Amino acid sequence: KTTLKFAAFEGGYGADMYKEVVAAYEKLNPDVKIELTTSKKIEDEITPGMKAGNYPDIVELGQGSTSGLTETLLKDKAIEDVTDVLDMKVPGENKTVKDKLVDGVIGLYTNPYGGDKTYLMPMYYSPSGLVYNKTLLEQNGWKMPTTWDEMFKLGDEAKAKGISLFTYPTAGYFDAFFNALLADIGGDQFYQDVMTYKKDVWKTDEAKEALETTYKLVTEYLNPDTVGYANAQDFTKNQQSILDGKSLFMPNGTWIVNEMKDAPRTSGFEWGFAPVPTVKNGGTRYINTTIEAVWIPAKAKNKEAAKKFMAYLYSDEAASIFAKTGAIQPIKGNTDDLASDMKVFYDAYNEDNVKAVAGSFSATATVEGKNIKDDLYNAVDSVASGKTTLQQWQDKLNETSNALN
């Protein structure tokens, strides 16, 4: 009887799970009719200056997406404060959302302006690191590196066999890669300092080491097809080079299994997963806990109905639907009895001297014509193409970060 408009990003876990969650919510609450739109081009729904009666009431779209829409609306103060959803009862259950969320998931990603106001409620719960064909490493006697010195020496051996060390799907996937590498090199406070624009942080030895390591990786050890395919249309072709045996490693998360399930692959292929290597031998390695986001536009017409549906995304019923393709909602218990195809990913948290990192950049400050994510992540394409030097990369980051500070 009351219509709610829900726009959801169609990513590697698939669109059908959202159709099924919506149907389950309507069975629980028959007086709600949800109009669901799923698409790889969500930005079509929410356009600048749109009329309030035409906005979606609720949107699933993480930070880091192709369009950058979530960050654009944060900059414009155009996303509703949904802190109150944390204290709402989950529909169909006798617990609140906060009762169910895993500890520590609320943080700089979900609370982008700092402080205790939540604007991006967390979706999924994917370790990110490096994926590879475990069988290919085994066939060659290659051990998974824990250091970049080992990685580069492995790249030297792999090239002799016609294999490039590294590819990436798009440059945006350096979000999780740098969260891990920065924490590896500098520690927890250093990572926080980068995300919050501490003065001169990109001129530290720690930050320079992160960039120098990544510069060498993408200028000496990159599959030559990577940059040309590193876009929303062709990213799966870069991923296909792992399945075809032409690249060894790429940064990714657990949606890669479902996303590539129908693709051809080399005989005996099996997914491997590891943390990003660190620099010092025996050093702590971090796994990034990658989440997407669900949120309510400030111009939404039906915010209260959207908040109740949002709370239902943390129900056991919803979690069971999402888990069929590997999408693991960030609620307690949801990694007990994991599907067998997820074991290789979540087992990485059990390696010795491995820790978790998570987050994104603070959205408190904005500067005209500057975007720190373009300067850190998107710049990798230019670096790999030989159009940005290592010094230019660092200098532009320090300039933008200091201006945001």
Ligand X SMILES: CC(=O)N[C@@H]1[C@@H](O[C@@H]2O[C@H](CO)[C@H](O)[C@H](O)[C@H]2O)[C@@H](O)[C@@H](CO)O[C@@H]1O
Whose CA is closest to 99, among 315, 254, 287?
A: 315
- Closer residue to ligand X (CB): 65 or 213: 65
Say whether residue 11 binds ligand X (CB under 6 A): yes
Q: Which does 175 bind (CB under 5 to 8 A by kind): ligand X, Na ion, none?
A: ligand X
Q: Which does 145 bind (CB under 5 to 8 A by kind): ligand X, Na ion, none?
A: none
Q: Which does 122 bind (CB under 5 to 8 A by kind): Na ion, ligand X, none?
A: none
- Closer residue to Na ion (CB): 56 or 127: 127
- Closer residue to Na ion (CB): 65 or 329: 329
Largest CA distance in the chain: 65
Distance CA 202, CA 75 (A): 23
Interface region with ligand X, contact rule CB under 6 A, candidates 60-68, 142-150, 335-343, 344-352: 60-68
Which one among 65, 146, 179, 329 touches ligand X, defined by CB under 6 A?
65
Secondary structure (DSSP) of 268-315: T--EEEEPPPBSSTT--EEEEEEEEEEE-BTT-S-HHHHHHHHHHTTS
Give pairs for 382-391: CB < 8 Å, separation 24+.
383/214, 383/215, 383/218, 383/219, 384/218, 384/219, 384/222, 384/226, 384/227, 385/227, 386/219, 390/211, 390/212, 390/215
At its nearest, how many Å lie between ligand X and the CB of residue 9? Answer: 6
Pairing of the two strands 247-253 and 121-133: antiparallel
- Closer residue to ligand X (CB): 148 or 255: 255
Which one among 7, 17, 57, 64 touches ligand X, defined by CB under 6 A?
64
Residue labelled with tokens 């106001």: 117
- Cα torsion 288, 294, 298, 304 to 10°: value is -140
Residues 324-353 that bind Na ion (CB under 5 A): 337
Residue labelled with tokens 């997406």: 65
Say whether residue 128 binds ligand X (CB under 6 A): yes
Q: Which does 13 bind (CB under 5 to 8 A by kind): Na ion, ligand X, none?
A: ligand X
Residues 229-268 that bind ligand X (CB under 6 A): 232, 235, 255, 259
Q: Characterize 307-317 residue by residue with b for buried, 16 or more Cβ atoms within 10 angstroms of its Cβ, and e for exposed.
A: bbbbbbbbbbb
Say whether residue 14 binds ligand X (CB under 6 A): no
- Closer residue to Na ion (CB): 120 or 323: 323
Contact residues toward ligand X (CB under 6 A) are 11-13, 62, 64-66, 128, 169-170, 172-173, 175-176, 232, 235, 255, 259, 290
Which residues are near Na ion by CB under 5 A? 337
